[PDB]
Amino acid sequence: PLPKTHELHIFGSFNGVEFDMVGRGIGNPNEGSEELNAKFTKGPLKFSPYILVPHLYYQYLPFPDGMSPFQAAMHDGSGYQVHRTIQYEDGASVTAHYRYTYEGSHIKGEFQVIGTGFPPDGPVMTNKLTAMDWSVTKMLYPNDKTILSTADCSYTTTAGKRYQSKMRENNTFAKPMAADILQKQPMFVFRKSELQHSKTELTFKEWQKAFTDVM
Amino acid sequence: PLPKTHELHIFGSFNGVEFDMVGRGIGNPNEGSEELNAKFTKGPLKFSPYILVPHLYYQYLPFPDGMSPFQAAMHDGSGYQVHRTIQYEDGASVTAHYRYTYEGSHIKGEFQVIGTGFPPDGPVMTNKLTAMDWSVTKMLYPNDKTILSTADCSYTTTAGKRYQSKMRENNTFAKPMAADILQKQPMFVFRKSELQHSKTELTFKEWQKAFTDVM
Amino acid sequence: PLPKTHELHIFGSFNGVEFDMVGRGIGNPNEGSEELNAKFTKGPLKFSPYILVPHLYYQYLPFPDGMSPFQAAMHDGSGYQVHRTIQYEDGASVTAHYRYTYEGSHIKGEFQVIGTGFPPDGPVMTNKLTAMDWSVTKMLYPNDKTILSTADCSYTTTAGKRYQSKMRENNTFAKPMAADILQKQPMFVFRKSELQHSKTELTFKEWQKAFTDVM
Amino acid sequence: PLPKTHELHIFGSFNGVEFDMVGRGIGNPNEGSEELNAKFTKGPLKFSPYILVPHLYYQYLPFPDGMSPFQAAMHDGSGYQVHRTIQYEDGASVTAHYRYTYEGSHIKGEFQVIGTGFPPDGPVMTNKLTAMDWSVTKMLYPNDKTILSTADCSYTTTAGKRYQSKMRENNTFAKPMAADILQKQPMFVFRKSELQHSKTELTFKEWQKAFTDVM
Numbered sequence: 001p002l003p004k005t006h007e008l009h010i011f012g013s014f015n016g017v018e019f020d021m022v023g024r025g026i027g028n029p030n031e032g033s034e035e036l037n038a039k040f041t042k043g044p045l046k047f048s049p050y051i052l053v054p055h056l057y058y059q060y061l062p063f064p065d066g067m068s069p070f071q072a073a074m075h076d077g078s079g080y081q082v083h084r085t086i087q088y089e090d091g092a093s094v095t096a097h098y099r100y101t102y103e104g105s106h107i108k109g110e111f112q113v114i115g116t117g118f119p120p121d122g123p124v125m126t127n128k129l130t131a132m133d134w135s136v137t138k139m140l141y142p143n144d145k146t147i148l149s150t151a152d153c154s155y156t157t158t159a160g161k162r163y164q165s166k167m168r169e170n171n172t173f174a175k176p177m178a179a180d181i182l183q184k185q186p187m188f189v190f191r192k193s194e195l196q197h198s199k200t201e202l203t204f205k206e207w208q209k210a211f212t213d214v215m
Numbered sequence: 216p217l218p219k220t221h222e223l224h225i226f227g228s229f230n231g232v233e234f235d236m237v238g239r240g241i242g243n244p245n246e247g248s249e250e251l252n253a254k255f256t257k258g259p260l261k262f263s264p265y266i267l268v269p270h271l272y273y274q275y276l277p278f279p280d281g282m283s284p285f286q287a288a289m290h291d292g293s294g295y296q297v298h299r300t301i302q303y304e305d306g307a308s309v310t311a312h313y314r315y316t317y318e319g320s321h322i323k324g325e326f327q328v329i330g331t332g333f334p335p336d337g338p339v340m341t342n343k344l345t346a347m348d349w350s351v352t353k354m355l356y357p358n359d360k361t362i363l364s365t366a367d368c369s370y371t372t373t374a375g376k377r378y379q380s381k382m383r384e385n386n387t388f389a390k391p392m393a394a395d396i397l398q399k400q401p402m403f404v405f406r407k408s409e410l411q412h413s414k415t416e417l418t419f420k421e422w423q424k425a426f427t428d429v430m
Numbered sequence: 431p432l433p434k435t436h437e438l439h440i441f442g443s444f445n446g447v448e449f450d451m452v453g454r455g456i457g458n459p460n461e462g463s464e465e466l467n468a469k470f471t472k473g474p475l476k477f478s479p480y481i482l483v484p485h486l487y488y489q490y491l492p493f494p495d496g497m498s499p500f501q502a503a504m505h506d507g508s509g510y511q512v513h514r515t516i517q518y519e520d521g522a523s524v525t526a527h528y529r530y531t532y533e534g535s536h537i538k539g540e541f542q543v544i545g546t547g548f549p550p551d552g553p554v555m556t557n558k559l560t561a562m563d564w565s566v567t568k569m570l571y572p573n574d575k576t577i578l579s580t581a582d583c584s585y586t587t588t589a590g591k592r593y594q595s596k597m598r599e600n601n602t603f604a605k606p607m608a609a610d611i612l613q614k615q616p617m618f619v620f621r622k623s624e625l626q627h628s629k630t631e632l633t634f635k636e637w638q639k640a641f642t643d644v645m
Numbered sequence: 646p647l648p649k650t651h652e653l654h655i656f657g658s659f660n661g662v663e664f665d666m667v668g669r670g671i672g673n674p675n676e677g678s679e680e681l682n683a684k685f686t687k688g689p690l691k692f693s694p695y696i697l698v699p700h701l702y703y704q705y706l707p708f709p710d711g712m713s714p715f716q717a718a719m720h721d722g723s724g725y726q727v728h729r730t731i732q733y734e735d736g737a738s739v740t741a742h743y744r745y746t747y748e749g750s751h752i753k754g755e756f757q758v759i760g761t762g763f764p765p766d767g768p769v770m771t772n773k774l775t776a777m778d779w780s781v782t783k784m785l786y787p788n789d790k791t792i793l794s795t796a797d798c799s800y801t802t803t804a805g806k807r808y809q810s811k812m813r814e815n816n817t818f819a820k821p822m823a824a825d826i827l828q829k830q831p832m833f834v835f836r837k838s839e840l841q842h843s844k845t846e847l848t849f850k851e852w853q854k855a856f857t858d859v860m
Contacts, residue, residue: 016511016575016602081446083546085515085523089734091578091809093515093600095525097544114527116513116600117576133401134428136351138367140377146445148521148547152353152365154401162355162400164736168523170546172446186348186369190429209430213349214405215422231726231790231817296661298761300730300738304519306594306793308730308813310740312759329742331728331815332793360661361762363736379521385738385761387661563831564858566781568797570807582783582795584831592785616778616799620859641859643779644835645852 002029002071003059006107008036010055012096014047014115015125021045025204027060029071032208034060039201047118049197050129050155054086054167055096055113056204061189063210069147069177074102076175084169086153092117092124123163129155132193133162139187144176149189184212217244217286218274221322223253225270227311229262229330230340236267240419242275244286247423249275254416262333264412265344265370269301269382270311270328271419276404278425284362284392289317291390299384301368307332307339338378344370347408348377354402359391364404399427432459432501433489436537438466440485442526444477444545445555451475453634457490459501462638464490469631477548479627480559480585484516484597485526485543486634491619493640499577499607504532506605514599516583522547522554553593559585562623563592569617574606579619614642647674647716648704651752653681655700657741659692659760660770666697670849672705674716677853679705684846692763694842695774695800699731699812700741700758701849706834708855714792714822719747721820729814731798737763768808774800777838778807784832792816794834829857 008023023038034057045052058070073080082098094115101108118124137151148170155163181187192207223238238253249272273285288295297313309330316323333339352366364384369377396402402425409420438453450471457464464487488500503510512528524545531538548554567581579599584592617640624635653668668683679702703715718725727743739760746753763769782796794814799807832855839850 083544085525091572093598095515114513116602117578120573136353136403138351140369142521143550146547150367154355170523172546188351207430211429214426214429215424298738298759300740306787308815310730329728331817332791335788357736358765363762387761566783566833568781570799580797584785618781637860639860644856644859645854
């Protein structure tokens with residue numbers, strides 16, 4: 001089935017210090033929307049919550065004329081895994097690996113996220129990020145089981161200068177993607193994120209829209 | 216004025232061998248369309264004409280709310296320059312610098328293009344490129360006179376594998392871009408390109424559309 | 431103390447397929463030499479064993495004037511972690527995280543290594559790598575607990591063309607590095623690797639030498 | 646012949662503003678040493694003179710066992726050209742193309758250098774660079790007429806933080822390099838630079854040493 005609900009377990013470390021968080025949410029797989037709440041297990045994170053945005057569910061993304069490959073792989077249970085790198089302009093790096101299991105229309109995510117090299121005086125460790133800019137991701141299918149996706153990402157900051165990164169990932173499928181997917185390349189995805197947080201929890205929302213054209 | 220016609224002069228070298236091209240064309244600055252016919256002046260090209268696509272006029276690009284910064288800088292004569300790098304997956308590199316002069320609605324381009332490190336058995340030197348994929352460019356304005364634009368570009372080939380590149384550029388303006396430009400970031404631009412070529416000449420078309428959103 | 435023996439548990443996945451290996455060896459921490467042997471647990475590896483070379487112990491590396499920061503962090507038990515990315519020329523990516531424990535002069539490594547996007551017909555998945563070229567890594571210390579290390583790496587192949595990658599890592603220390611280490615930047619490290627393998631096992635050797643100058 | 650003297654002409658622009666500089670120097674092609682003096686011809690330099698270091702003569706570099714390919718190509722008159730890109734960590738970029746002519750043991754260089762995207766408050770435009778760090782360049786020979794060279798470069802600054810860049814170039818030869826050069830890869834080159842400057846002139850010195858090994 002298409003998803004209705006999801007849970008998240010995100011674990012790993014930033015600058016060598018372990019973190020762990022759990023959250024739960026819902027979404028609309030016909031519209032590419034999702035929302036998630038996460039209560040901190042033991043006080044605020046030691047870094048900007050905004051750095052978590054890409055790690056806070058492509059199963060909610062439909063494609064223009066049917067299921068996305070993500071949806072198809074959830075629907076038949078065969079699945080996919082995500083392997084992502086993010087290189088930040090101040091020399092920090094994040095690597096991430098997402099695994100999923102499904103229980104009918106419920107998704108369970110197990111996301112390992114490792115970040116290093118964030119300067120102690122930089123905008124991540126001193127909580128100066130204010131929002132993530134809207135993004136366009138480019139997707140290509142080098143083979144029938146593999147998506148390569150790239151985006152140039154940026155956050156606004158309290159200082160007014162943007163904090164930029166390069167995001168690259170593979171999405172690796174256990175079963176080939178369908179011909180209706182592979183025949184249309186590149187596929188782009190527009191994404192909007194919203195995050196609010198307090199000292200004790202965060203709320204996250206994302207809107208995603210796949211497109212081959214705007215003209 | 217907004218542009219209606221243009222001429223092209225590309226000069227430089229690929230793998231150490233000089234080339235030169237001249238062309239002329241037209242475009243619609245209200246629709247982001249352009250068309251060019253061109254000829255090689257030092258005999259037949261030693262490399263795939265498709266490599267020239269990005270070098271074959273953002274003055275034809277309107278913005279959603281008004282003139283693009285490119286149009287504004289042509290209209291008041293203050294101008295901009297383009298400084299572009301392209302890094303190809305097989306280790307080749309192109310650097311380019313575009314200068315323009317304006318005569319009413321006519322644009323004169325002087326574009327220096329230098330390419331090196333194209334493998335002699337690669338898809339550029341052996342004419343295996345078949346089309347340029349549609350693209351999305353992301354633009355940010357790190358300061359009021361500078362655009363940073365990035366795109367992940369790809370060509371289809373006869374070998375069935377794409378030929379990928381990273382394109383990056385600064386666009387440097389003599390006068391600040393207007394507030395109605397600076398206020399809207401990121402700005403994306405969708406581009407479609409068509410190229411036909413023979414041993415002596417080519418015909419090129421491009422369609423460009425700026426967007427802040429697709430939702 | 432300085433290390434004399436080590437073992438390795440390396441695990442993760444390549445192109446979505448899990449692997450797990452254990453190896454053991456020895457090294458000379460006054461000379462920067464080490465050796466490791468490993469049997470394939472459950473049949474041959476599904477990818478070139480040469481891709482494992484950087485993942486197959488800087489505690490064996492002395493510095494030009496005394497202990498390396500790696501050796502100092504082992505001596506006092508405070509330790510360090512390694513977080514590494516490798517980007518290959520054909521679009522594949524590897525991410526890795528190394529954690530260590532110490533029992534006297536014995537090192538235990540737990541290394542998670544995840545690779546994706548290796549083309550099925552490329553040199554890794556078809557076992558065309560023949561050796562790893564000698565390398566120079568550049569090290570800088572952006573802060574007193576963090577090393578940033580970069581190298582441009584290359585393998586020879588059976589086709590007589592090299593297979594290139596960009597390697598980047600942070601080494602994150604629990605305690606600050608000593609002032610005498612921090613004072614000498616950049617620090618370079620020359621490395622030579624040797625690997626032999628059959629269908630059932632591999633044998634690895636590495637020599638490493640730190641240097642600030644060659645003149 | 647081997648070179649003994651040289652002249653420099655650098656032309657191009659930084660952040661859209663034209664610059665032009667000429668200088669004269671000497672060197673020792675048996676030792677990999679050179680020195681150059683340049684007086685400022687049209688007023689004070691509008692950016693850190695340290696940014697010019699890589700642009701301020703590989704014909705002075707011998708190889709370990711004989712003439713370098715640069716020296717061979719000068720000596721037989723066939724020559725080489727340099728095509729270089731430098732990407733700086735704050736988003737600035739420099740592209741460069743070096744052409745040479747020879748008059749006996751005298752080199753004449755014509756170097757086009759274009760830089761863009763240097764932040765007006767960054768260390769280049771506010772003269773905070775204090776020295777270029779010693780460097781290691783890695784050279785490979787993808788074909789018998791082409792060198793690909795890479796280096797991770799860094800300057801010290803008055804802020805204490807290093808200013809890093811990625812330098813990449815091709816060196817393209819009119820005639821094949823000697824067979825006795827081509828199988829010894831990678832070839833590394835260690836470089837030390839010194840720059841003295843006043844309001845009216847600069848004096849530059851470089852030492853270069855090729856090496857395949859340090860053990």
